[PDB]
Subunit: 239 residues, 4 copies
């Protein structure tokens, strides 16, 4: 085309991404100083302006990127993310939900989607999640079953920790982290239900024994592959 | 046969397992809402009925499965488990042991034995336990020896933590998890027995150094096997 | 010889080790019941007798084993251990050091030296220690340097935690375990010395980063060996 | 040359390093006794003298080493370190910064730079840091983004923990270590902001899931290399 390809050469240019990566870091320092109320009393409106500027520059950048990339933009996770963290940044501060004014900061994660060094890492870390979804399901069911049981056993005399399935979910996650599991939870529990240890010591055993085997499988299974991709390139040459 | 093979085609069918997996998830949501007393005041008897229904459907399912599978049912762990978690579900609520009304929830673990994706994981995780039984024994003896020693050294001035072999077992397990081992246990201990650190710092060292080597062996030993199953398939082809 | 070889066939026999392994387990149950004062009020002297019996049986067993094994007994760690844990068991209860009456229990560790299944594990776990001694030295020096620094920085306003090199050693080990390192130690420290985080956050970083690399090296280095013992058996056959 | 090569043979000699390694250990014991005020009341000035001696001996040693090694001394990290930890040791005790009198102890780290066994380890541990710098950056950005968010969400009602970006940095690091993350931080937070768990449970998930994959990558990636350096030496011989 003509106007399309004129835009495309700008969007796909190094200066464009450099300019965005530039603005991202500039806004990043802006949001960190925005925490200090000394700075907000002094250089206050300077940054609300400079924030409102970058938001529209990012909307323009997203609009241009949509015209260039067409359906592929809405099938790219890094683009879909960039879309949503600016869409969040666009909903005005006026609402009965001031938490969206805090979700503004997620637009600093653009420095991941914009810098290909970070994307490579983030992709590598996420790439382990697919196989773990099956083990994640077993653990989530395990948690749900014990959270039912704990709510029924302990939620009566211990409402804060167990009086509700959601609380027992939180508390059991705290037991998984071993955070004050004994002194803070099980030992007070045992002052009323002496056999509560029969519930939690196995829970700590299963939960831990799975987390370990999850990591062990991640290592040993990833490397039977390299031990067969080598087992193949060696039989390649003797034939 | 005739009536046997008529049953077998039903039990071994996809609809049968699908229908059980269906009921399992339905009962799973039932038990989670059963925790809320708002729901139990409203839709209360709806779920006691629907529970009593699924229990008999499961007994029928187990009865049918026993007639089909014969001795192999009572030699299959997944079947033996399904047997016991429904047998637990059958003992009536009337007893001086209301904990069996809570063990009802273990029938949600049927979703493991019924969904072959989960069974594959559970089998993989359990498959590491066999070799660990030898190291588990050494640790359990190590614990027993120190639990004797700790009960004799500290159980006098510190009954809650050490006044009994069982308590010293629990406390030493808490020291293994490092849960408040210093601020909560050893530091108060040292206010009376200044050399208590001579007992626990080595205990933390041995217990940790074994747990690490247990995991390291799980990895390195699992993969000398893949490094010899490859060492074999390479000598295969040069001869 | 004549009387020598008559003894040797007994000592080296299966019944002899079986009889010792038997007595060890019997004494093991004895010491566990010896903790209960209900049992000691009832079956009390029964076990002091039965203990005094096993001690001499073990001395006889050690004496016989010394005559058979000659200098090799005092060059065998399992024998040297069996020697010392019975020698400890022989020093009479009368002393201004009643802790030796508790070290009696270490004679339950004979079940390790007597059962070859356990010895194999204990040997495997200890076999990692040799290479770690070099990294252990660096960490022990690292601890000593910071324990000097912490005693000088914090031992004034905080004697319990840091008022002495030994206490700073203990406290720093507690920081290594992350046991209440922030809420219990560094946060109170920062109420007086606001930059104490500059001391401990790096200490947590170095200490952790070494522990991880210690384990990583244990795995990756153990398995370049299996990756070259295979690299050798493959070049073996193509020549 | 003449005077140059006369110095060089001394500096590069075994006695020279031995004499320094000697003095280092001697000063190491000196600084440990210097903590005891009983010792400082008695043998006090003995060690201030002996310290002032070793400092100049080390300056001489550094001066000689600079004349020998020329530009290579100021391009060697072990030398650059030895330079700085003695330069720190030279700034006189008189200042409004008595912390430099504590940084004297870093001259005990010379025993690392002087003993080639330690240098080999320290080099091996540091050698993992290069590849981790990319993942370290992602985590440091992740921390910065959430530390902004936490300061804005919680710093109002919770100034000690979150009232400042620096405090939220410290607190989030404490949550990463799981040190009292629930009982000490999130549970008090939830007494005011009930959905604070929506902030921290994911933070614990991401932070942990990265730390694990960081270690897993360190292992699995280090050993595709040994699995291709072997994959190469095997194709070497079949051609
Ligand atoms: C998108 C990527 C962008 C990357 C940008 C990286 C650099 C960001 C720098 C931001 C600096 C913000 C400093 C700031 O707000 O300081 C707040 C507080 C001081 O609060 P304040 O109320 O001013 O103190 C008043 C003191 N008084 C009473 C004596 C008048 O003081 C503090 O909180 C202490 C200073 C904390 C600095 C934390 C720096 C974190 C760097 C993270 C780098 C990540 C790179 C990926
Ligand atoms: C490998 C490791 C696998 C771990 C799997 C289990 C993870 C469990 C995480 C803990 C969840 C948790 O915090 O539970 C609390 C929530 C909220 O309940 P709520 O009733 O709001 O009570 C919160 C506490 N309160 C009353 C004091 C405000 O409780 C709920 O409402 C439960 C919500 C669902 C929890 C599980 C969701 C899926 C987790 C898996 C994530 C996979 C990521 C790829
Ligand atoms: C066999 C497999 C079956 C899988 C089924 C998965 C889905 C199960 C859903 C169960 C939902 C149960 C909800 C429930 O009971 O909520 C209890 C509490 C509310 O208690 P409630 O007393 O009603 O609150 C009264 C409030 N008031 C005063 C204003 C009137 O509120 C809470 O506790 C908050 C909601 C917690 C939801 C936790 C969801 C966990 C999902 C785990 C999924 C595992 C998949 C394998
Ligand atoms: C790899 C890791 C290997 C770890 C091996 C050691 C595991 C030790 C686990 C801790 C056991 C524990 O909780 O001890 C407490 C129990 C009950 O004593 P009890 O007198 O009821 O006192 C409980 C506390 N109280 C008084 C406040 C109610 O104390 C006892 O009565 C002791 C019961 C036997 C404990 C050991 C049983 C075998 C554990 C190994 C499991 C292998 C799974 C395949
Ligand atoms: C050399 C290898 C030998 C291996 C031997 C393994 C078996 C050892 C069994 C020892 C059993 C000792 C039982 C015992 O002393 O119990 C103490 C306490 C009860 O104290 P007590 O003062 O009698 O309670 C009075 C109750 N009252 C007021 C109602 C009258 O009750 C408790 O503490 C509860 C029971 C704790 C049992 C712990 C069992 C640990 C097994 C470890 C196995 C390791 C195998 C390698
Ligand atoms: C891989 C991991 C490597 C770790 C290396 C560092 C380990 C440090 C362990 C912590 C030592 C410790 O508990 O320090 C306390 C002792 C006793 O000092 P003390 O003055 O009695 O104060 C104790 C506390 N108090 C006053 C309340 C009674 O403080 C001292 O007196 C220090 C004694 C020497 C400590 C280091 C000994 C070598 C440890 C390495 C073990 C290798 C095993 C193969
Ligand atoms: C460059 C490498 C050099 C390596 C040198 C290794 C050896 C260093 C030995 C230093 C010994 C220092 C002993 C010391 O200052 O003890 C301080 C305190 C006692 O304080 P003090 O105020 O004398 O107690 C008075 C008692 N009263 C009231 C009854 C009169 O008592 C304690 O703190 C207890 C003793 C703690 C000893 C800690 C030993 C750590 C060894 C680390 C080895 C690392 C090797 C790389
Ligand atoms: C793999 C693991 C990667 C982990 C990456 C994140 C590490 C974060 C470490 C925590 C930092 C920290 O302690 O934050 C506190 C500082 C000082 O703030 P400050 O305002 O002084 O408040 C301190 C607390 N107070 C008010 C009670 C005295 O807060 C600040 O001022 C922030 C200073 C920058 C923090 C990050 C610096 C780079 C860390 C990466 C190190 C790489 C080593 C190769
Ligand atoms: C075996 C266990 C549990 C499932 C099970 O046991 N069944 C699962 C859970 C996590 C899975 C790995 C990760 O996904 C990362 C990676 C993705 C590649 O694509 C294939 C290789 C690798 C190493 C996967 C292998 C395997 O699938 C793992 C170990
Ligand atoms: C060597 C140590 C301790 C025993 C000892 O050192 N002796 C033991 C404890 C756990 C054992 C592994 C697990 O069982 C899983 C798996 C089962 C396979 O069947 C064979 C391979 C593998 C990897 C086992 C190898 C080895 O047996 C291990 C590492
Ligand atoms: C060759 C087979 C036979 C038994 C297998 C192991 C066991 O299955 C236990 C465990 C399951 C995890 O999933 C992955 C890790 C581990 C150690 C397996 C590794 C490997 O696959 C082995 C050695
Ligand atoms: C490389 C690091 C640190 C020393 C250093 O980096 N130099 C050291 C510390 C622990 C050492 C291992 C253990 O000893 C166990 C085992 C003993 C065998 O005999 C040889 C193989 C193996 C795996 C050792 C290799 C290597 O020696 C390790 C990893
Ligand atoms: C893959 C991940 C993350 C980066 C990413 O995913 N991209 C990064 C972070 C740490 C990196 C390793 C360490 O540096 C140590 C060592 C240095 C050698 O030189 C090359 C090999 C090795 C094992 C490195 C491989 C790889 O680079 C790692 C695993
Ligand atoms: C082939 C060489 C070149 C760089 C080496 C790695 C680095 O040295 C860092 C680290 C040191 C530990 O000691 C052992 C683990 C690790 C990851 C090494 C493994 C291996 O040796 C590598 C990949």
């Amino acid at each position: 085309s003509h106007m399309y390809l004129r835009i495309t050469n700008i969007v796909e240019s190094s200066f464009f991404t450099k300019f965005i990566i530039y603005l991202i870091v500039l806004n990043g320092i802006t949001m960190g100083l925005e925490t200090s109320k000394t700075f907000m009393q002094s250089f206050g409106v300077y940054t609300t302006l400079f924030n409102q500027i970058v938001i529209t520059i990012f909307t323009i950048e997203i609009i241009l990127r949509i015209y260039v990339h067409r359906i592929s933009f809405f099938k790219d996770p890094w683009s879909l993310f960039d879309f949503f963290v600016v869409a969040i940044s666009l909903v005005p501060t006026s609402s009965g939900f001031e938490i969206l004014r805090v979700l503004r900061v997620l637009r600093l994660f653009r420095l991941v989607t914009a810098v290909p060094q970070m994307r490579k890492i983030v992709s590598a870390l996420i790439s382990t999640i697919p196989g773990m979804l099956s083990v994640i399901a077993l653990m989530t069911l395990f948690f749900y079953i014990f959270a039912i049981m704990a709510t029924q056993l302990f939620g009566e005399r211990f409402p804060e920790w167990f009086g509700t399935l959601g609380e027992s979910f939180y508390t059991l996650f705290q037991v998984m982290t071993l955070e004050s599991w004994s002194m803070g939870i099980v030992r007070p529990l045992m002052e009323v239900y002496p056999y509560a240890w029969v519930f939690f010591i196995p829970f700590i055993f299963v939960v831990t024994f799975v987390m370990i085997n999850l990591v062990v499988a991640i290592i040993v299974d990833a490397m039977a592959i390299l031990n067969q991709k080598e087992e193949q390139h060696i039989i390649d040459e003797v034939q």
